[PDB]
């Protein structure tokens, strides 16, 4: 039934000042300051937690290898695979609508 104090100088219950009451090897309870939790990286096109990317503190990405920060596709570490799929489809058909419009344009010029 041990009561527990803050360890750092901030006496307030802020976002940064969270507390875990941990039992120490001295047989007594003491507070542990909880590190602010890491979030999932998100789809820039989708708005969804993209798979296969490590979830770390922003600064913590500098230490880890590139195979924990990127999946193997094009737009790998920034998009969804669904949002990549959708823009492969989109860029293809837009590029082919350009061809059809040139065919119609060349035909109308020959008509005049």
Partner RNA sequence: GAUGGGGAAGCUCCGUUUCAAAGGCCUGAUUUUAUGCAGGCCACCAUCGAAAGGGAAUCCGGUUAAGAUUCCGGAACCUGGAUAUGGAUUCUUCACGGUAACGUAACUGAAUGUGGAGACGUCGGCGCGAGCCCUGGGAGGAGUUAUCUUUUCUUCUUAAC
Partner RNA sequence: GCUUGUGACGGCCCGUGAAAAUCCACAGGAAGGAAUAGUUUUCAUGCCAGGUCGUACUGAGGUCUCCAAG
Residues that bind RNA (CB under 7 A): 1, 3-4, 6-7, 9-30, 32-33, 35-44, 47, 50-53, 57-71, 73-82
- Could you say which residues in the range 80-99 bind another protein, by CB under 8 A? 81, 84-93, 96
Distance (Å) of CA 24 to CA 6, 19, 29, 45, 57: 15, 15, 6, 46, 27
The residue (of 59 and 112) whose beta carbon lies closer to RNA is 59
**Number of Cα atoms under 13 Å in the Cβ half of residue 63:** 7
As measured in angstroms, the least distance from the Cβ of 96 to RNA is: 18
Distance (Å) of CA 14 to CA 30, 44, 53: 19, 30, 29
As measured in angstroms, the least distance from the Cβ of 103 to RNA is: 26
The residue (of 90 and 102) whose beta carbon lies closer to another protein is 90
Q: Give the contact letters, 41-80, x = binds to another protein (CB under 8 A), - = no.
A: -------------------------------xxxx-----
Among RNA, another protein, none, partner that 39 touches (CB below 5 to 8 angstroms by kind): RNA
Contact by Cβ (8 Å): 22, 32: yes
CA atoms of 4 and 21, how far apart (whole Å)? 7
């Amino acid at each position: 039934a041990q009561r527990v104090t803050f360890r750092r100088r901030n006496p307030y219950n802020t976002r940064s000042n969270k507390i875990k009451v941990v039992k120490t090897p001295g047989g007594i309870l003491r507070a542990q300051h909880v590190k602010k939790l890491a979030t999932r990286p998100k789809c820039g096109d989708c708005g969804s937690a993209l798979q296969g990317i490590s979830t770390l503190r922003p600064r913590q990405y500098a230490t880890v290898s590139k195979t924990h920060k990127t999946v193997s596709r094009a737009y790998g570490g920034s998009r969804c695979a669904n949002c990549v799929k959708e823009r492969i489809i989109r860029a293809f058909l837009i590029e082919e609508q350009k061809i059809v419009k040139k065919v119609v344009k060349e035909q109308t010029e020959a008509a005049k």
